[PDB]
Each structure stands twice: as C-alpha cells, then as structure tokens.
Amino acid sequence: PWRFLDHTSFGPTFQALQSFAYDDTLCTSIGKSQSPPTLRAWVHHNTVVLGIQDSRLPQIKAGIEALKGFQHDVIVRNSGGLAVVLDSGILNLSLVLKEEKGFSIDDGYELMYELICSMFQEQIEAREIVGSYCPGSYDLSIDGKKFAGISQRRIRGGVAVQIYLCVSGSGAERAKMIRTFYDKAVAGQPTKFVYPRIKPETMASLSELLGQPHNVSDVLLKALMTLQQHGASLLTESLSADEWLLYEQHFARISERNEKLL
Structure with missing residues (x-):
C-alpha cells in the first residue's frame, strides 16, 4: 500500500527547499520501515535550482542576477547535478521506497522510466540529451527532444527516485534562460567542469x-491511474508526527547550506 502526497497545488511561497526537506524526511522514515512507500508530486513557482558546481562558476553573481532578471528565484542543491528549471508547467514526482539488496541505482532509474512509458503507453528514449540543461544518462525524450530529467537521492536507508516532467509551455524557452545563465556565469573563462553547451x-x-x-493535473492523474x-x-x-520532526530538522540543515553556498 503506497502513500500519496500532493504538493502540486500550493502558492508561489512553497519553496523548492521545503520540497527537498520532504524527500529527505521520506527517505529517513521509509528507511526505518516506519512509513509505506511514497509517491510525492510537487510543483514550484519560477525557480532555478543550481548544482554545487554551477555556484562556483567564475561570474556566478552575474549569472544569478540574470536569472533574477527572469523573475526566477535561485537556490543551489548541495548534491550538485546541474541547473534545472522549476515552474508551474513542471511536474515533479518523487518515488520514495526502501533501500534493499538487489535494488540498484539503475533499478531505481528503470522503475521511474517504465512508469513514464506506461503513463503514456515506443517513442520515449532514456538517453542523455546533449545540448540540454542538467543532462543525464536517464534523460527522457521523444523525437530526440528532452522532456524530463531523472536523479536519485539515497540517505538513511531510503531511496528517492525523482523526475521533473516538462508538461506545458515551451521546452526551448526554458533552455534559453539557462543558456543565458551559463553565458553570464562562465563569461568565456575557464571553468572547473564541463558545463552544458x-x-x-x-x-x-x-x-x-x-x-x-x-x-x-492531467499528467498527475495519469500517474495515479497507472x-x-x-x-x-x-x-x-x-506526514506523521515523527516525520514532521525530521522535516523541521532536515529543512533547517538544507536552508542553512543554501544560504551559505550563496
């Protein structure tokens, strides 16, 4: 019996940082066998989540200024992946389950992949899309165009397979903003990593x-039915009472590490 957590209908004050705290709380409680597997759906207003590496770019302050120029708030996720966009047209799903023997990193990615394909029951590839932001081995696409990105978070015996699904609007417009981010952040200077072009x-x-x-909501419904x-x-x-305690604790740590990184 899975538990479902709906975080898709809150105001623009609901922060991505809180979302991070929730997934961490779930990994911790499900990892102690105190909570059932959980499907958590979430959405945030104009937010650009940078990776640790993005935050150390040579002209980062100019990059963040550009992003604030797009009316997007900016935060950095400690376990750095790479800049990804979050807005009302982006549905995020976190499948949090118990870490067990035989359930590999790729097993987690494969589960989320199967889940997407079923929700849209031969066109969807799981392949890194060169040219896209936050590129990964399990980028999802159709006709060669990336519409989703997957990552995995594992702490306290819990596994959180997360995906961002670009549901509405233009995938390219979101990319142009990120391209502008790298243009101003890199500024034709050497960098400590291979940033996406x-x-x-x-x-x-x-x-x-x-x-x-x-x-x-249409895509959320599909996932639920699937x-x-x-x-x-x-x-x-x-959340249970104990989870709320873990949430506050997790959010305090997360919130402080973000303020620092900035």
Missing part, C-alpha cells in the same frame, strides 16, 4: 511533443 531546440514540453495541451492499474493501493495521507 545549451541548444534550446533539443528540449520540449510534453504538450509540444504530444501535439495537444496537457496541464500538470500506479493503481498496476496493483498499488494509493492513500492520500499527510
């Missing part, structure tokens, strides 16, 4: 790829 055309939202408009059609008993619940 953004090619806007290699990214697209599901609405653009499927040829018809979809909103976050899970139950596959045997899961989804129950809409809130």
